[PDB]
Amino acid sequence: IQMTQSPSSVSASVGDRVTITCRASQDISTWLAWYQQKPGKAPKLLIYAASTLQSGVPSRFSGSGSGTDFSLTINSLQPEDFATYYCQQANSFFTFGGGTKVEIKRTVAAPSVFIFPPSDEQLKSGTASVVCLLNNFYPREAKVQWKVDNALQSGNSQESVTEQDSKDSTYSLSSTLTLSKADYEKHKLYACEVTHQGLSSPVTKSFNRGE
């Protein structure tokens, strides 16, 4: 009753032939279904019984496999096919696989990095949020390390990433470091060190409080 999908993400271009896999921890015959899902929308059935195409779904979609190994293939990827795909055991239970996102392939691009100190407005309220922006990079994997007076901060920041850009297929990331006003005024150097496969070495953007 454990469904595994790998890769967790795959990059492709329109026209490409894409294949994603799913493996059950047990033998489920052909009681397997595949779904498609896009942000903010409910899932959509694509295939059932492992290889039967749902009525209305483009014939470019196909599925095969039995036992524990299954696959979904998209022959000539169309722009409307970039989305997340899930397999699901239909035998006993109804365990869903973890999902595999099909993203748009493009060349590696290092992020442009910017840092924003907290506003005077917010400081008045007793809190200080420092923001680091990683703009238009690819692929999605990136690492942000916050440092205050050279001390690595951990557990006091949060980040999120946008969906691929509509025109350049890149991602952007925003990270916020939050400290009490008291802690903020007790330190001078605020920096965010960024690592990304497109960068030969870490890029650091910083400011000195009261700069």
Binding site: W31, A33, Y35, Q37, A42, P43, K44, L45, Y48, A49, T52, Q54, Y86, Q88, A90, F93, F94, T95, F96, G97, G98, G99, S112, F114, I115, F116, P117, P118, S119, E121, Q122, S125, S129, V131, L133, N135, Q158, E159, S160, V161, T162, D165, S172, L173, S174, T176, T178, K205, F207
Partner: protein, 219 residues
């Protein structure tokens, strides 16, 4: 023809109980199982349970056994999902599903119901500027934005100059802070040469609290 329509978004405190409905139309409700699935923001699908409308026989996912109750009213073609001892981790979109054609798959899905669980109460955000400076300039481009902090629950929408500015705009997914409140940022990259002339205003709208904020961002 066939469709599943769920109740509206809900906000709850931890430890509370929530009960959502799903109205079925276009097929004989009591003749087929009704399934419930949930999905936490940006996460995967998770099957919760199912019910035989006719005799109220149910089956629940192991992790929900004990806190979940699935019922149905064949008199009104409506099924219900009740989840108790709510935890912040229960924040998610809950879906009902059915298989009217017995394909052995979830053929039809409701539009989903967002249930937000937090100790926080509905609250509008404070909007702070992310001011353009030498630390946000790249060549002839500059980055600026707005920090939409401490609101609950989702969602919040952001536009720039009332929609007149869309190019180079990036509005990020919100992050849920330990305080039980959300925070998000929206940024835009523009020609640094336009900073001293062009006005940039981010329009923030948090419908749950009827809070609207227009924030002018200057260098």
């Amino acid at each position: 023809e066939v469709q599943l329509v769920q109740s509206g978004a809900e906000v709850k405190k931890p430890g509370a109980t929530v009960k959502i409905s799903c109205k079925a139309s276009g097929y004989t409700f009591s003749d087929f199982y009704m399934y419930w699935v949930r999905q936490a923001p940006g996460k995967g699908l998770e099957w919760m349970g199912l019910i035989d409308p006719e005799d109220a026989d149910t089956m629940y996912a192991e992790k929900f056994r004990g806190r979940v109750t699935i019922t149905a009213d064949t008199s009104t073609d409506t099924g219900y999902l009740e989840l108790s001892s709510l935890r912040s981790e229960d924040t998610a979109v809950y879906y009902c599903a059915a298989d009217p054609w017995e394909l052995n798959a979830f053929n039809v899905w409701g539009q989903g119901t967002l249930v937000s669980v937090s100790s926080a109460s509905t609250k509008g955000p404070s909007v702070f500027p992310l001011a353009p400076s030498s630390k946000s300039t790249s060549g002839g481009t500059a980055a600026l934005g707005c920090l939409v902090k401490d609101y609950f629950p989702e969602p919040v929408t952001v536009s720039w100059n009332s929609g007149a500015l869309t190019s180079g705009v990036h509005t990020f997914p919100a992050v849920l802070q330990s305080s039980g409140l959300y925070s998000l940022s929206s940024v835009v990259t523009v020609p640094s040469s336009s900073l001293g002339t062009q006005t940039y205003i981010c329009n923030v709208n948090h419908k749950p609290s009827n809070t609207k904020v227009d924030k002018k961002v200057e260098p």
